[PDB]
């Protein structure tokens, strides 16, 4: 599909033309719409801005120098002068501080008094506060503070080569398994342009293959070398490992550009990103001509954007004569990926491994949270060394398993020692995630119980004993009723094998299977179904339409998506103001693909500036694009988090509730203490304010201002309903004909209304309504009237 | 880390009783101030008299142990068999004493004394 790429390039130049026309409209609107005292005020303002600018740049440049005789003396003088400046400003602030710290009785006010602003350190400090409170309540002394006198103080008489470190670094690089095969590696790289390189873990493929291309000189003409990853954390891990392999700091030739972390100082050879920036400079670049040879991440993660990338790589193989592209791979399932790229050659790498005998149970059971407890007690009475990883499939059962295992641990004293067990979640603060990565005590047999994070993304040190039941939740969406069931499924044989690879990544593995070997070989799955046959494509149909493909269901792929998902996506786009009668994107249809949010959330932007209220619904469209779920309600506490959440509640659905959460988080210092005392995860909603910053930045391309109606939240809900017309319900959905159920975590769990919209259709136990909002079906009939008939 | 053997011997030593540092509600017990004078005005609020106004099982901890006193109090009585000789034990014809276990309405009067457990004690 070379003409597809040519038409996509033509769409890039008319997108630049539309940007130039909007720029011309911007300067058109800009052009259409006591003298020594003025000099003195101009100089006071200009010297104030110059003073703050040099003050901001000063320790920034000290940090820039420290990241890298007279220069040392100037750095010492510069450190001393910022030290004197900070104590000078702290002395002025301290003079103000005990200017404030007086008696200062409250004034008797006419009517109600006015509340003022406050504080101390919230997260964790009250435990040590209670510890030294008990210490001060117990410890005691007498006499005055001058009581050290009359001390004779008798003393005891008693009886009268960094070059070698760099050479060790290349010895470490020589110790890789890819180092004896690097000549055959670059030989096959020069042989074939579509080469798949598979290899077991421990080979160091993602950190040596761009290196082995870098002495191969494929990056020679300034067309740089890129490294995509399924995850930004894995991308930063590979970037940091390669960056300390050469000692080249970030921003320089080993640099990265991910979302809200773009550290490239325009000298970057080894650039590090994920698949979404390959999407974004496909949306800004027609073909990677500024990239000579780019390695490809594995397909076992089965990211939908990487499958679209596989289709684009096959189109590059049709378009360019070559790019000498190469796909790093983990396991031996490369036959389909070989045949997808016109009989692509596959080169295997041997991986250094361990005896990882897969065990079995001589009984079938349907419990797997007490038989494994009996098994880990048997582990604790057999051979001591080795960390324990036990897999489960959900938060609400893994916290109960943690509670009962901690009860079994605290039932015994000196017998059953240590055994600290830590769970892994997604809507989770990262402090105890770092405590997972902390090494075990030597008298401990530390257990990290987990969901699929340790299966897919996470590799932790020292793990030997792994219990596996082979079950995970799948978000299987059926468009026959339009219902997105989150249902627990048994996992795959290759999933159990990569869990065994996680078991034997460090030492001799002890992957205890929680069922029979017959059920592992026969009854278990052997191939994981991808995301396209489990879900819809509502975020990427618009992007694939705007990236020059009109033959979307005729587009080349490994496996096609279900046609009902494409049909409902196109009919939804017809109900949206994005497609014409001929099924093609408009100017608004192109502009809603400028920003990567869903079109169902881009009718937020299309209802923005209809009667304004744009800032509120743009904040809402930022924060409802979160991956991890909001609010941190742990095991125990409960009522404190519930009372904070009830204080956050406002009528009109939970969107206004969490809008109040973000609004009062604004002008709160953006602190961890706020989210700690309000029981909010301080990892995901920080990413939500970063998304809010990015979507504030990406507003001139759609040419929508940051207007707000200043508390007209019924009109904000009118714009929200203008967006959310397909996802509505009367105790029944008017479209899906399904009886609704309200989630207990919703703000409107009580008071079941006559008309409510919703956002999400996840089945867990009941046909649940997630992220509801109260309506009356008045302005619902205003938006998509072709969709709406018979009340 | 602080092991079990660091504070295991001194588990119930100290006036605030070192085991109290590993309590469940000790984090929300960081806010109770003046609970001594709360008890000393709870004597003005409650018609019954508290003898343990001067202590706290959560703050100060538990300050004694009487189970060894119970064991030696049993031992000073000439033994369990000597006690069961005094009681009506052999009329019950149990093989052993070790299986033994002890245990919206309207009425014209409700404050009557229960004759039944004193009768069974007799």
């Amino acid at each position: 599909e070379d003409e597809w790429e040519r038409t996509e390039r033509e769409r890039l130049q008319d997108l630049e033309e539309r940007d130039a026309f909007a720029e011309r409209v911007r300067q058109r609107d800009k052009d259409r719409t006591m003298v020594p005292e003025l000099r003195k005020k101009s100089r006071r303002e200009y010297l104030a801005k110059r003073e703050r600018e040099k003050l901001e740049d000063l320790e920034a440049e000290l940090a820039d120098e420290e990241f890298l005789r007279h220069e040392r003396q100037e750095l010492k003088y510069k450190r001393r002068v910022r030290d004197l400046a900070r104590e000078y400003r702290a002395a002025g602030e301290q003079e103000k501080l005990e200017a404030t710290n007086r008696y200062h009785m409250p004034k008797e006010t006419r009517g109600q008094p006015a509340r003022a602003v406050d504080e101390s350190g919230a997260p964790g400090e009250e435990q040590r506060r209670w510890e030294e409170a008990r210490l001060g309540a117990a410890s005691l002394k007498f006499g005055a503070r001058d009581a050290a006198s009359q001390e004779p103080k008798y003393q005891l008489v008693l009886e009268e080569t960094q070059a070698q470190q760099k050479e060790s670094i290349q010895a470490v690089r020589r110790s890789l398994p890819v180092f004896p095969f690097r000549e055959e590696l670059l030989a096959a790289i020069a042989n074939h342009q579509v080469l798949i390189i598979e290899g077991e873990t421990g080979s160091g493929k993602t950190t040596q293959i761009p290196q082995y291309l870098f002495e191969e000189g494929y990056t020679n003409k300034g067309m740089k070398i890129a490294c995509t990853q399924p995850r930004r954390v894995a991308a930063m891990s590979v970037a940091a490992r390669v960056a300390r392999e050469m000692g080249v700091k970030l921003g320089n030739e080993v640099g990265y550009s991910i979302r809200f972390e773009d550290c490239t100082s325009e000298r970057t050879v080894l650039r590090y990103m994920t698949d979404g920036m390959l999407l974004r400079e496909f949306l800004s670049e027609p073909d990677l001509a500024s990239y000579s040879v780019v390695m490809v991440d594995e397909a076992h993660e089965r990211t939908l954007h990487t499958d679209i990338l596989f289709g684009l790589i096959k189109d590059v193989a049709r378009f360019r004569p070559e790019l000498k592209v190469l796909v790093a791979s983990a396991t031996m399932d490369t036959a389909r990926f070989s045949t997808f790229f016109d009989d692509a050659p596959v080169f295997r790498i041997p991986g250094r491994r361990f005896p990882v005998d897969i065990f079995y149970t001589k009984a079938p059971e349907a419990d797997y949270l007490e038989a494994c407890v009996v098994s880990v007690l048997q582990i604790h009475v057999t051979q001591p060394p080795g960390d324990i990883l036990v897999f489960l499939t959900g938060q609400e059962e893994i916290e109960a398993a943690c509670e009962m295992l901690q009860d079994r641990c605290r039932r015994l004293g000196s017998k059953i020692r240590e055994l600290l067990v830590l769970p892994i979640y997604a809507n989770l603060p990262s402090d105890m995630q770092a405590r997972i990565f902390q090494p075990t005590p030597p008298g401990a047999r530390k257990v990290v119980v987990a969901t699929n994070i340790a299966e897919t993304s996470l590799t932790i040190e020292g793990i030997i004993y792994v219990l596996d039941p082979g079950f995970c939740k799948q978000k299987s969406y059926n468009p026959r009723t339009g219902m997105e069931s989150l249902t627990v499924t048994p996992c795959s044989k290759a999933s159990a094998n990569q869990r065994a690879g996680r078991a034997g990544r460090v030492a001799a593995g002890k992957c205890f299977r929680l069922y029979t070997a017959w059920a592992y070989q026969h009854e278990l799955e052997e191939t994981t179904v991808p995301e396209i046959q489990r879900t819809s494509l509502g975020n990427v149909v618009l992007l694939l339409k705007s990236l020059g493909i009109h033959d979307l269901m005729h587009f080349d792929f490994l496996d096609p998506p279900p046609y009902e998902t494409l049909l409902l996506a196109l009919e939804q786009l017809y109900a949206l103001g994005a497609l014409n009668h001929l099924g093609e994107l408009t100017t608004s249809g192109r502009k809603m693909a400028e920003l990567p949010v869903d079109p169902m959330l881009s009718k937020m932007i299309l209802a923005s500036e209809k009667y304004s209220c744009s800032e509120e619904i743009l904040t809402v469209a930022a924060m409802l694009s979160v991956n991890n779920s909001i609010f941190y309600r742990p095991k125990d506490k409960v009522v404190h988090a519930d009372n904070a959440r009830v204080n956050f509640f406002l009528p009109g659905g939970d969107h206004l509730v969490l809008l109040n959460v973000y609004t009062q988080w604004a002008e709160s210092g953006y602190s961890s203490q706020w989210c700690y005392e309000n029981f909010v995860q301080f990892r995901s909603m920080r990413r939500a304010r970063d998304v809010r910053e990015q979507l504030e930045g990406l507003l001139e391309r759609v040419e929508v201002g940051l207007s707000s109606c200043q508390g007209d939240y019924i009109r904000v809900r009118k714009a929200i309903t203008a967006g959310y017309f397909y996802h509505t319900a009367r105790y029944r959905t008017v479209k899906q004909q399904q009886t609704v159920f309200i989630h207990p975590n919703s703000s409107l769990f009580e008071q079941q209304p006559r008309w409510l919209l919703y956002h999400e259709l996840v089945l867990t136990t009941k046909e649940f309504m997630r992220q509801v909002l109260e309506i009356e079906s008045s302005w619902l009939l205003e938006v998509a009237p072709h969709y709406y008939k018979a009340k | 880390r602080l092991t079990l053997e660091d504070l295991e011997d001194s588990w119930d030593r100290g006036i605030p009783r070192i085991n109290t540092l590993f309590q469940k509600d000790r984090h929300t017990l960081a806010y109770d101030k003046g609970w001594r004078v709360r008890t000393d005005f709870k004597q003005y609020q409650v018609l019954k008299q508290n003898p343990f106004w001067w202590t706290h099982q959560r703050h100060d901890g538990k300050l004694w142990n009487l189970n060894n006193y119970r064991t030696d109090m049993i031992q000073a009585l000439g033994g369990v068999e000597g006690i069961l000789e005094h009681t009506l034990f052999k009329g019950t014809y149990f093989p052993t004493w070790e299986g033994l276990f002890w245990e919206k309405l309207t009425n014209a009067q409700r404050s009557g004394l229960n004759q039944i457990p004193n009768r069974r004690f007799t």
Partner: peptide, 28 residues
């Protein structure tokens, strides 16, 4: 608990360990 016995005897008052500590403080 002979391990806890010798651990308490090694983390006890220990005048000879005090002499090692003070002798190293004097030599240093």
């Amino acid at each position: 608990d002979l391990d806890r016995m010798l651990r308490e005897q090694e983390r006890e008052g220990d005048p000879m360990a005090n002499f090692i500590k003070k002798n190293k403080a004097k030599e240093n």
